[PDB]
Amino acid sequence: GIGTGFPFDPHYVEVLGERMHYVDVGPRDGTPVLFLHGNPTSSYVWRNIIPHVAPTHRCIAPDLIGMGKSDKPDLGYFFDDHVRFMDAFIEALGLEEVVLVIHDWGSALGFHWAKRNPERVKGIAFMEFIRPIPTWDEWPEFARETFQAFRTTDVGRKLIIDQNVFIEGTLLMGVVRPLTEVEMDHYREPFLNPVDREPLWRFPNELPIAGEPANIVALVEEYMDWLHQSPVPKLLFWGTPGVLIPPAEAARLAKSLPNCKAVDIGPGLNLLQEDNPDLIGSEIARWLSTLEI
Numbered sequence: 001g002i003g004t005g006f007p008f009d010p011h012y013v014e015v016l017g018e019r020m021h022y023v024d025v026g027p028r029d030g031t032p033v034l035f036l037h038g039n040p041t042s043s044y045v046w047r048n049i050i051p052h053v054a055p056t057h058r059c060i061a062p063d064l065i066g067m068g069k070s071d072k073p074d075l076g077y078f079f080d081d082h083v084r085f086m087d088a089f090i091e092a093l094g095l096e097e098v099v100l101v102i103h104d105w106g107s108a109l110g111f112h113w114a115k116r117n118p119e120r121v122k123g124i125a126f127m128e129f130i131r132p133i134p135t136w137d138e139w140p141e142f143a144r145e146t147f148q149a150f151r152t153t154d155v156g157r158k159l160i161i162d163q164n165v166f167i168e169g170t171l172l173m174g175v176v177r178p179l180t181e182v183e184m185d186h187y188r189e190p191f192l193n194p195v196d197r198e199p200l201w202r203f204p205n206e207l208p209i210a211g212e213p214a215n216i217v218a219l220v221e222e223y224m225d226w227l228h229q230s231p232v233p234k235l236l237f238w239g240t241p242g243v244l245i246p247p248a249e250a251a252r253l254a255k256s257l258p259n260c261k262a263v264d265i266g267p268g269l270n271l272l273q274e275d276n277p278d279l280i281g282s283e284i285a286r287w288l289s290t291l292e293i
């Protein structure tokens, strides 16, 4: 079945005075492919996708600051903090032109960096990505009251920080197929200590839903406007019913985004990588061979 191991040798780089962990495999030359995870995952979410790409392209998969094997300083872990560290990680590795493979909050990082640095982005593969959610009616009904509760400093912190609900419950409700105990232990490992769970709570409080927070909504609207005009090659993966990207939204993007190929992965919620890694990996590898990289 789907692989549960994480066989990658650890790599570390100092970034703004903190150590960030990253996977780094594949050939040394060529245009690298930079894989960005979101909440509440790590580079572990790419473990079954990278092996389809690493034969022919360098794959770099960092753990976001405060997550995975990266350092966990006592920050608020706002989106702006993640932007500062990811900007610096990219520079610390000396990356020039990249292809991006992005998911959930990693897609907000990737699209925001791409919009600010369009000359350095040769392609974007994306899935279950951060877009403005116009009203709460556009958040999936089965998860609406819980995400509304997450976005409070009393109940939301009790659930996410004290009780680890984003790992023990929300994560499982973002994958259609059942995760194994081994896989769950990989996802639990960075957050065994409750004091380290701040990013798990701040991330859903940054989601652009019903106009809040206004600053994130504005930032996300900006990169979506860029994406709707930019000629950058685009590869969209979507599933049914999805979470952030329902089928009808995927269809709108497939019809409207320039230079965009859309791939239906079958059943999927948020972590599409956990439901169909073989199709995502093989399609990324095929798409890469068509780029001018």
Ligand SMILES: [Cl-]
Binding pocket: 039, 203, 204, 205, 207
């Ligand atoms: Cl989130």
